[PDB]
PDB file of C-alpha atoms (C1' of nucleotides) in Angstrom:
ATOM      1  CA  UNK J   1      89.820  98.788 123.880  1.00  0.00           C
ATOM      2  CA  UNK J   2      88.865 102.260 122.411  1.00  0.00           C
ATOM      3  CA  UNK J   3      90.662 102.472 120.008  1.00  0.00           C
ATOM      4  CA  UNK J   4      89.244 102.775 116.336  1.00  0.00           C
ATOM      5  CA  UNK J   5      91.272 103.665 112.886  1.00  0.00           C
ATOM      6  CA  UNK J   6      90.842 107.282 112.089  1.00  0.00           C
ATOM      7  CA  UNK J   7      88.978 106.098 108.633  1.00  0.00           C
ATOM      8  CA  UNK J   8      86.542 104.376 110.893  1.00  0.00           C
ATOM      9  CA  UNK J   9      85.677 107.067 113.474  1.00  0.00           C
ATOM     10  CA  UNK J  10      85.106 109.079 110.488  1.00  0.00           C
ATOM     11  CA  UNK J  11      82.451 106.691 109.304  1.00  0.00           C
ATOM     12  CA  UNK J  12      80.919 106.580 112.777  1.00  0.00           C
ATOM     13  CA  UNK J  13      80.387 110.288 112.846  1.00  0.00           C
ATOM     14  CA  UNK J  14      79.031 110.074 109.409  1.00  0.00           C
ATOM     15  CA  UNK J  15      76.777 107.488 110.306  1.00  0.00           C
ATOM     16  CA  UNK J  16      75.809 109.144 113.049  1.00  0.00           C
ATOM     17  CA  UNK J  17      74.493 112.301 111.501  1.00  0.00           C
ATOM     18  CA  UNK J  18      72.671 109.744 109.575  1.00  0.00           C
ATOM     19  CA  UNK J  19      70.288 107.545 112.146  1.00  0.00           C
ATOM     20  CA  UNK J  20      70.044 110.651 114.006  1.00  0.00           C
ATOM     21  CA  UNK J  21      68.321 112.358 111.098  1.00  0.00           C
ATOM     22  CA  UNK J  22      70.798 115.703 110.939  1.00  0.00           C
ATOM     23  CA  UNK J  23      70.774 114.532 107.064  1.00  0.00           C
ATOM     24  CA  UNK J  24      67.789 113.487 105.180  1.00  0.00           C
ATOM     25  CA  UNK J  25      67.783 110.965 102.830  1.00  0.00           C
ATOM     26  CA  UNK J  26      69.085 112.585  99.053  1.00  0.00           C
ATOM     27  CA  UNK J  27      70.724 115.720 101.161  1.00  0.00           C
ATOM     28  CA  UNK J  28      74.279 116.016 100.125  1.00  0.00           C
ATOM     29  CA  UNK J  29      77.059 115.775 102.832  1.00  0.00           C
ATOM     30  CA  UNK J  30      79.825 118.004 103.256  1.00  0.00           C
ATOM     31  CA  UNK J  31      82.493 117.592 100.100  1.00  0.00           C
ATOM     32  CA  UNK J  32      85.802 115.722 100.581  1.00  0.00           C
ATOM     33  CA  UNK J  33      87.891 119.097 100.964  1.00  0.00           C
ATOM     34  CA  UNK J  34      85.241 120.156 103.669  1.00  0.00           C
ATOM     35  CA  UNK J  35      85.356 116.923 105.645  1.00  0.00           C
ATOM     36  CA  UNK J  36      89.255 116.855 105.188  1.00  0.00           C
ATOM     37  CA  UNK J  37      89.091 120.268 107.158  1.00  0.00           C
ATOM     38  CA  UNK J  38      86.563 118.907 109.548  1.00  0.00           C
ATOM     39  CA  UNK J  39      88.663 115.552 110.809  1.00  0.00           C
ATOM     40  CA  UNK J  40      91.777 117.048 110.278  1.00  0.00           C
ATOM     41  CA  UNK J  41      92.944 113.868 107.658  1.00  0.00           C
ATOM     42  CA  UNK J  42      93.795 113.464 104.352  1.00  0.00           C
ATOM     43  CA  UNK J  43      91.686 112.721 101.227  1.00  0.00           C
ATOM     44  CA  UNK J  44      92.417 109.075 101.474  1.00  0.00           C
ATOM     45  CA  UNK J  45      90.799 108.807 105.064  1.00  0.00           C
ATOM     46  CA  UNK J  46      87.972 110.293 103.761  1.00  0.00           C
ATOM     47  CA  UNK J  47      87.401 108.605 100.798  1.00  0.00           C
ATOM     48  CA  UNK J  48      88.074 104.983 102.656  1.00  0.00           C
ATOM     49  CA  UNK J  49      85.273 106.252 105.302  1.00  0.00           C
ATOM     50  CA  UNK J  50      82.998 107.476 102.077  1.00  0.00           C
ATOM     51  CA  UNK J  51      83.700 104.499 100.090  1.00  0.00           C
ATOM     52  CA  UNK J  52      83.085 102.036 102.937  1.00  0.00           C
ATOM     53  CA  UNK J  53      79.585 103.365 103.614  1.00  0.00           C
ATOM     54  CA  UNK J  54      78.652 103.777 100.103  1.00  0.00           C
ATOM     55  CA  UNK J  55      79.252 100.040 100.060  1.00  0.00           C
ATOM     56  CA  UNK J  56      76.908  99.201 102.785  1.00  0.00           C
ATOM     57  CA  UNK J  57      74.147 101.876 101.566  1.00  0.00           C
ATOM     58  CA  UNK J  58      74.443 104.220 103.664  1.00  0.00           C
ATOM     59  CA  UNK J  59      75.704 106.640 101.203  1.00  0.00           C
ATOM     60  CA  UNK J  60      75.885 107.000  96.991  1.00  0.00           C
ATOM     61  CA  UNK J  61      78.065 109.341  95.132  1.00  0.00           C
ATOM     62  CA  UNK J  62      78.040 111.577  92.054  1.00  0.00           C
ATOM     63  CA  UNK J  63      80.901 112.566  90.161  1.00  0.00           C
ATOM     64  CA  UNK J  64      80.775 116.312  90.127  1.00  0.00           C
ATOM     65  CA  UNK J  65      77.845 116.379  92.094  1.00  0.00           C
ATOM     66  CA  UNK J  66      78.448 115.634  95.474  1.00  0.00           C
ATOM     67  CA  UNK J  67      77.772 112.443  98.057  1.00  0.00           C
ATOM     68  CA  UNK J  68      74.447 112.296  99.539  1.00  0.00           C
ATOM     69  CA  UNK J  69      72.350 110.309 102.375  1.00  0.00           C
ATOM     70  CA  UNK J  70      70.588 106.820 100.448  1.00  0.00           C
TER      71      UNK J  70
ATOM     72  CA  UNK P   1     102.146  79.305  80.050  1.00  0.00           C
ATOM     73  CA  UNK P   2     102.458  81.089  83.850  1.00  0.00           C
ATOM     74  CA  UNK P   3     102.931  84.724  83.963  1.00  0.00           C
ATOM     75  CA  UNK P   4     101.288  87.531  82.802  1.00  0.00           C
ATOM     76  CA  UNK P   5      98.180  89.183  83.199  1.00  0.00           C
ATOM     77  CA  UNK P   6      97.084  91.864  80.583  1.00  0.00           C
ATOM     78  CA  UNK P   7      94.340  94.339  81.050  1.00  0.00           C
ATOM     79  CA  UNK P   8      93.468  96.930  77.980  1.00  0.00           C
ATOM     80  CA  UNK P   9      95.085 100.349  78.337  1.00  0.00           C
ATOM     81  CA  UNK P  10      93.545 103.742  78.324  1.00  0.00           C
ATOM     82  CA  UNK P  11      94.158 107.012  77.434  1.00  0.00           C
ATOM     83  CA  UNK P  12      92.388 106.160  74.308  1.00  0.00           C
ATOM     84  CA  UNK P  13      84.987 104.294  74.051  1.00  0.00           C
ATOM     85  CA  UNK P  14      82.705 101.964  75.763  1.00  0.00           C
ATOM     86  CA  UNK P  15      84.344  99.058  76.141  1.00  0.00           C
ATOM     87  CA  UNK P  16      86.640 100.397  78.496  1.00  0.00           C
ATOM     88  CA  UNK P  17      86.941  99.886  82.343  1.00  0.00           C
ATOM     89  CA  UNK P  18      89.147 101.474  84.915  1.00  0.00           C
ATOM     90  CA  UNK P  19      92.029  99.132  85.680  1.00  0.00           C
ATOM     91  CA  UNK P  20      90.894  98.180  89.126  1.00  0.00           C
ATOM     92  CA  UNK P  21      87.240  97.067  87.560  1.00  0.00           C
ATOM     93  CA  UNK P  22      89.017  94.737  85.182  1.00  0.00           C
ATOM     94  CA  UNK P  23      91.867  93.373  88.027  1.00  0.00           C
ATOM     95  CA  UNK P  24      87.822  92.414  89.569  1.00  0.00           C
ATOM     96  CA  UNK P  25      86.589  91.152  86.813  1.00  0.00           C
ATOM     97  CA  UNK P  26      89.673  88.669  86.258  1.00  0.00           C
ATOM     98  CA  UNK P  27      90.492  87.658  89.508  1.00  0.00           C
ATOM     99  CA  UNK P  28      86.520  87.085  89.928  1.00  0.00           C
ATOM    100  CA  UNK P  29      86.938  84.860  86.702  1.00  0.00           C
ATOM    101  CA  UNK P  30      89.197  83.144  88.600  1.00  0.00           C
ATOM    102  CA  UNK P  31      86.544  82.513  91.069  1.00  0.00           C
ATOM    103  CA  UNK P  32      83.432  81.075  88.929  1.00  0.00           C
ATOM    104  CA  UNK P  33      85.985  79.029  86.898  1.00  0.00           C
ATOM    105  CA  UNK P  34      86.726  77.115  89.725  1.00  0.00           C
ATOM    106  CA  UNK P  35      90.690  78.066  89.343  1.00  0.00           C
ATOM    107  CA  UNK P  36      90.834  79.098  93.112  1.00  0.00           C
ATOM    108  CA  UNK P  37      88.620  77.541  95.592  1.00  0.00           C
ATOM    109  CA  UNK P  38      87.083  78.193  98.913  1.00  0.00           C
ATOM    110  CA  UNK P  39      89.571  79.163 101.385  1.00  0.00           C
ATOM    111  CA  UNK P  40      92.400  78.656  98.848  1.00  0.00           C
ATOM    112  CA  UNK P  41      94.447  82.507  99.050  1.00  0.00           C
ATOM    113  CA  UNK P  42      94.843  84.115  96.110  1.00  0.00           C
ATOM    114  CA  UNK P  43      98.486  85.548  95.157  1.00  0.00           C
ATOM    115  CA  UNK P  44      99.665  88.334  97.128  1.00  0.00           C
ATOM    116  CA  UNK P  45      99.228  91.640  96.872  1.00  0.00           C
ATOM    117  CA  UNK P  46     103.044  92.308  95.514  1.00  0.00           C
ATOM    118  CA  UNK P  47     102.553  88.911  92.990  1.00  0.00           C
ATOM    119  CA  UNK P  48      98.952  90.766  92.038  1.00  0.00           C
ATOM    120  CA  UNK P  49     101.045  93.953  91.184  1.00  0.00           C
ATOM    121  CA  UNK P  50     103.552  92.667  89.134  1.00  0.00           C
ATOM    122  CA  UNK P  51     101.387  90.323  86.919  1.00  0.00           C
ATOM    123  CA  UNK P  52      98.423  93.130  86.416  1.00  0.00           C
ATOM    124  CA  UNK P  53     101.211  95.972  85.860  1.00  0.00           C
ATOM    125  CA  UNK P  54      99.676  97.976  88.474  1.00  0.00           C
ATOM    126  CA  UNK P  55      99.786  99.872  91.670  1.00  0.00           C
ATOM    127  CA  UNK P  56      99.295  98.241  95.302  1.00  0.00           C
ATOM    128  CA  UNK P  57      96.767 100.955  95.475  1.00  0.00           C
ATOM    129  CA  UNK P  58      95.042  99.786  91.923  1.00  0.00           C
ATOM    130  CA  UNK P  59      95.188  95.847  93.295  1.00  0.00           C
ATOM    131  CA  UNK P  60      93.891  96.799  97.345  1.00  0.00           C
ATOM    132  CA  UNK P  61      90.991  98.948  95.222  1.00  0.00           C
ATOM    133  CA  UNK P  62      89.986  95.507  93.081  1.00  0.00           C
ATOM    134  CA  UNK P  63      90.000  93.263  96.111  1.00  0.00           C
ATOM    135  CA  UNK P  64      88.574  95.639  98.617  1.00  0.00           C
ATOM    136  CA  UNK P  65      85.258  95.601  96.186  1.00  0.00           C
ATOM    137  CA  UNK P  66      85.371  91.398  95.649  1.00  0.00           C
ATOM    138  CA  UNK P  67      85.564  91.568 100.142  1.00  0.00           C
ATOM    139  CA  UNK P  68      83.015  94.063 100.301  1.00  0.00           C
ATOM    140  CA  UNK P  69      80.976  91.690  98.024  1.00  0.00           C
ATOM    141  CA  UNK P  70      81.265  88.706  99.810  1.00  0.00           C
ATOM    142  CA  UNK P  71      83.488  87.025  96.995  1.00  0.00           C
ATOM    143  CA  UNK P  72      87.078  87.122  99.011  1.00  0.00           C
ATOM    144  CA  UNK P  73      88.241  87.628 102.907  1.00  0.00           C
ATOM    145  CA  UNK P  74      91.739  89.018 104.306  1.00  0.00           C
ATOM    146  CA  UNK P  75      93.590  87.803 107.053  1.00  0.00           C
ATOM    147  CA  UNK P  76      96.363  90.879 107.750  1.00  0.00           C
ATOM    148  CA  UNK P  77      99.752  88.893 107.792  1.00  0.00           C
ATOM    149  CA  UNK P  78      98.024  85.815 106.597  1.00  0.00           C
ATOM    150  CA  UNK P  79      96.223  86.393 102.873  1.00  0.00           C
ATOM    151  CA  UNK P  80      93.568  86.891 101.244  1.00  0.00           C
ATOM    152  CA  UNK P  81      91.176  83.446 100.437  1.00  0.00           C
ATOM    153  CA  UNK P  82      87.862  82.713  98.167  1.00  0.00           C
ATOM    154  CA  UNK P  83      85.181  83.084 100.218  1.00  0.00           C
TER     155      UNK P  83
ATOM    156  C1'  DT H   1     111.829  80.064 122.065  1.00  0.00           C
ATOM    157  C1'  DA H   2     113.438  84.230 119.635  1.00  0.00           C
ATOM    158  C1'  DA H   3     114.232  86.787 115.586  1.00  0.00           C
ATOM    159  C1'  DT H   4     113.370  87.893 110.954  1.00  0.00           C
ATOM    160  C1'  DA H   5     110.575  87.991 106.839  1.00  0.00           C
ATOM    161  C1'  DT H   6     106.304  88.231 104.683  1.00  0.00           C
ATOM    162  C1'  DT H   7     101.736  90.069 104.064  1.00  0.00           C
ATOM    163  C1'  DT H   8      97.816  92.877 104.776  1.00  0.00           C
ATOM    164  C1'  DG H   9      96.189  97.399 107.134  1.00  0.00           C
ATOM    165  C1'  DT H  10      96.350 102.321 107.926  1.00  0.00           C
ATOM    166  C1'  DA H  11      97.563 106.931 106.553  1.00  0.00           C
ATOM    167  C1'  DC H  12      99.302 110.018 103.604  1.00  0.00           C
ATOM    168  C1'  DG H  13     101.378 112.328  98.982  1.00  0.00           C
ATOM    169  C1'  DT H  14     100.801 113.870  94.170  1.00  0.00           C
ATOM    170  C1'  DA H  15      98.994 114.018  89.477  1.00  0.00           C
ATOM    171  C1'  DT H  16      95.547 113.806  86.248  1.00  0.00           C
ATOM    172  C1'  DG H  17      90.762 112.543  84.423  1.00  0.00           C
ATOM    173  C1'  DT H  18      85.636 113.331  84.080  1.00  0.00           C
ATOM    174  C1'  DA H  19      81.015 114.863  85.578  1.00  0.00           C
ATOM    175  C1'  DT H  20      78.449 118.257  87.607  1.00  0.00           C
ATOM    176  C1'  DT H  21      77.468 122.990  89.052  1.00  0.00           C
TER     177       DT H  21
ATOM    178  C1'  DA Z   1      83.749 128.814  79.942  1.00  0.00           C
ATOM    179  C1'  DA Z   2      85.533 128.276  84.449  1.00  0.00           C
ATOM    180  C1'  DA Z   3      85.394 126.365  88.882  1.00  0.00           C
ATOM    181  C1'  DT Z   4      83.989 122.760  91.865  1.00  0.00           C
ATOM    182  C1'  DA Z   5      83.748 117.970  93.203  1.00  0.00           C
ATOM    183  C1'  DC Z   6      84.248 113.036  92.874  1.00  0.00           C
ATOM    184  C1'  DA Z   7      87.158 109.140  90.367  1.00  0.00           C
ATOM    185  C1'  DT Z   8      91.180 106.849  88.922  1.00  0.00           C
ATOM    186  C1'  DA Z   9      95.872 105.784  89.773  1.00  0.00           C
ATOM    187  C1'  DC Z  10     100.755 106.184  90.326  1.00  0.00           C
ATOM    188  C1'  DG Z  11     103.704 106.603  94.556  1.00  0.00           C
ATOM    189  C1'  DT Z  12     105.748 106.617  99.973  1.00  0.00           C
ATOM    190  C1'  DA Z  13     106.189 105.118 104.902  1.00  0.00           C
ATOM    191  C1'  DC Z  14     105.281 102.509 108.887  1.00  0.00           C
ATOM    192  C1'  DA Z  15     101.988  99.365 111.866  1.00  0.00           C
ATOM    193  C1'  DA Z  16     100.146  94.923 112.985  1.00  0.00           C
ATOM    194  C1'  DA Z  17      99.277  90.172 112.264  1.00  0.00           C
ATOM    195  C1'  DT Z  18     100.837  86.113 110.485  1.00  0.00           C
ATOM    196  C1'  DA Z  19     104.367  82.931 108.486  1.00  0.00           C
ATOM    197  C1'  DT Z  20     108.937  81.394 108.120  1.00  0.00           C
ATOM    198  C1'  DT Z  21     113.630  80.545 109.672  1.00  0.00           C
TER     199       DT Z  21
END
DNA sequence: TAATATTTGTACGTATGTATT
DNA sequence: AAATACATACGTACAAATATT
């Protein structure tokens, strides 16, 4: 099957623009309203997509800053 | 003598942790002490709730960390078990 | 065997707090 | 000082997998 949660296809796509270089490492990603906008999903999604791949590395996060390629 | 769990409240400096970091820190103490054992499931998510005084979202938070760090696994419909 | 209940998973809603810009 | 952005945390509903009856 094809089928993927919509929390997980966002963390492909993320991933993706890492690997593939479009974001350097310590260059900020879009924000959470941005990528809310972009997937068409709520905050939640987001932030389970974020939160998984700041978990594996791929990602780290500052408060009032922003979340940014590892 | 079996129920309740307190953790420290907050709207009141450096000894403080959000509620989900202390539901990990006690169900992790838990593990360590030996209380639960591999593959023995830890209470459910709604028994978790009601002796922490918190929100599914609060408990799910807590144990999503402990699975991300290798400490606990979920089986949807099933549990969730010491690692 | 079939149906129902339980339990975790996904997705979203809303409010408020805190750090950075 | 105000606005922006991530963090914490309360809630809802329904899906999917497992357990129970």
């Amino acid at each position: 099957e094809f089928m993927l949660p919509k929390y997980a296809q966002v963390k492909e796509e993320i991933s993706s623009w890492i690997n593939q270089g479009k974001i350097l490492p310590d260059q900020k990603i879009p924000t959470e309203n941005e990528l809310m906008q972009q997937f068409g999903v709520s905050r939640h999604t987001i932030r389970k997509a974020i939160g998984d791949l700041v978990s594996q590395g791929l990602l780290y996060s500052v408060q009032g800053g922003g979340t940014f390629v590892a």
